[PDB]
Design a protein around this ligand. Structure first.
Ligand SMILES: COc1ccc(C2=NN(C3CCN(c4nc(N)nc5ccccc45)CC3)C(=O)[C@@H]3CC=CC[C@H]23)cc1OC
Ligand SMILES: COc1ccc(C2=NN(C3CCN(c4nc(N)nc5ccccc45)CC3)C(=O)[C@@H]3CC=CC[C@H]23)cc1OC
Ligand SMILES: [Mg+2]
Ligand SMILES: [Zn+2]
Length: 325
């Protein structure tokens, strides 16, 4: 192998990279190999003076804090979200829009955004009186935790990849990362999407020209939505990848359902393996969450995302066509 891995990683800039193959070929290190590849490609190690073995140490440590016994929310998902963010950042319509620090922030935020995920929802954590829910006052419990862990890991031996940033740089980056990860909580989705829509309309009536994001609020909003799109990108991928993501999320959700049915709590939506149509849930996920978001994103970067939207629509028809009687 290894030479085969190098060959697969040549697809790093493409939508639809075989991320599950990369995970197999790297000894279950897709996050480390993908992040390293992206960092080298974008010359981020030179730009921010990140020593290479410090980066690798951090990445291996981060990756080890993702759980391999969690079906969906593991290191492969993290890797997928990083790589997807990387491709979105390279979309023609955003060329030269974002600084190197902003790029760094978005890619870092993607890498850490689900770290130490236990495989159960915020509502489940809240309902069981978990220590995490008690620490974070039932508010974006998981996302606050992902951030805390991602930042804390920089303190392990030879893990401080930001050692060479200036203080002002660290401060800015820290704020962006926080804003970005907290925006991955689905309770924020409707407000995020409303703002994005507003921005899109504003653009249509203001300028046929290039994108102008002149204050933090608009800039961060686009970054938030970008990583949120990457987080919600499974149904936009080649169907063979999408179906594996569907298998994984349903295994995680059904396992939460099994833990909820015992203890007599309400089974969360889509978590009842005795009463659930996987295919129907995918169509609903597309119709109510993924397509409205991606259609709006596609509008912002028109026509860069047309093929992603076409894939989404074909993928929706696939699940729609296989819904049981
Ligand atoms: C003697 O002179 C060199 C010897 C080896 C390398 C090596 N470079 N690299 C990277 C290391 C991290 N980078 C930079 N980091 C930081 N903090 N500062 C930089 C300043 C200017 C350019 C790059 C960096 C990006 C490149 C490898 O990955 C090689 C393979 C394995 C180990 C080190 C090698 C570079 C040299 O001079 C630039
Ligand atoms: C591959 O397939 C999926 C991948 C990820 C997720 C994810 N799902 N979600 C939620 C999304 C909205 N949900 C719905 N709830 C309620 N009451 N009603 C609904 C009606 C129609 C559609 C959805 C819902 C609950 C779960 C997360 O919170 C995950 C973590 C972060 C981002 C997305 C993840 C789902 C997938 O397929 C269903
Ligand atoms: Mg999450
Ligand atoms: Zn995620």
């Amino acid at each position: 192998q290894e030479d085969v891995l190098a060959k697969e990683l040549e697809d790093v800039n493409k939508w639809g990279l075989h991320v599950f193959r990369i995970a197999e070929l790297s000894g279950n290190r897709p996050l480390t190999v993908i992040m390293h590849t992206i960092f080298q490609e974008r010359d981020l190690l030179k730009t921010f003076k990140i020593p290479v073995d410090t980066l690798i140490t951090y990445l291996m440590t981060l990756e080890d804090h993702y759980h391999a016994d969690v079906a969906y929310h593991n290191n492969i998902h993290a890797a997928d979200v990083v790589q997807s963010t990387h491709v979105l950042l390279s979309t023609p319509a955003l060329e030269a829009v974002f600084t190197d620090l902003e790029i760094l922030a978005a890619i870092f935020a993607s890498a850490i955004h689900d770290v130490d995920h236990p495989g159960v929802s915020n509502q489940f954590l809240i309902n069981t009186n978990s220590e995490l829910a008690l620490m974070y006052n039932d508010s974006s419990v998981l996302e606050n935790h992902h951030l805390a862990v991602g930042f804390k890991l920089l303190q392990e031996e030879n893990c401080d990849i930001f050692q060479n940033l200036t203080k002002k740089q660290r401060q800015s980056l820290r704020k962006m990362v926080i804003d970005i990860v907290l925006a991955t909580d689905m309770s924020k989705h409707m407000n995020l999407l409303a703002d994005l829509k507003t921005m899109v309309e504003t653009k249509k009536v203001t300028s046929s020209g290039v994108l102008l994001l002149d204050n933090y609020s608009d800039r961060i909003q686009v970054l938030q939505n970008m990583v949120h799109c990457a987080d919600l990108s499974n149904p936009t991928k080649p169907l063979q990848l999408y179906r594996q993501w569907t298998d994984r999320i349903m295994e995680e959700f059904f396992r939460q359902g099994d833990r909820e049915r015992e203890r007599g709590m309400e089974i969360s939506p889509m978590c009842d393996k005795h009463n659930a149509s996987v295919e129907k849930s995918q169509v609903g996920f597309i119709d109510y969450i993924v397509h409205p978001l991606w259609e709006t994103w596609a509008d912002l970067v028109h026509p860069d995302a047309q093929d992603i939207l076409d894939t989404l629509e074909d993928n929706r028809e696939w699940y729609q066509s296989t819904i049981p009687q």
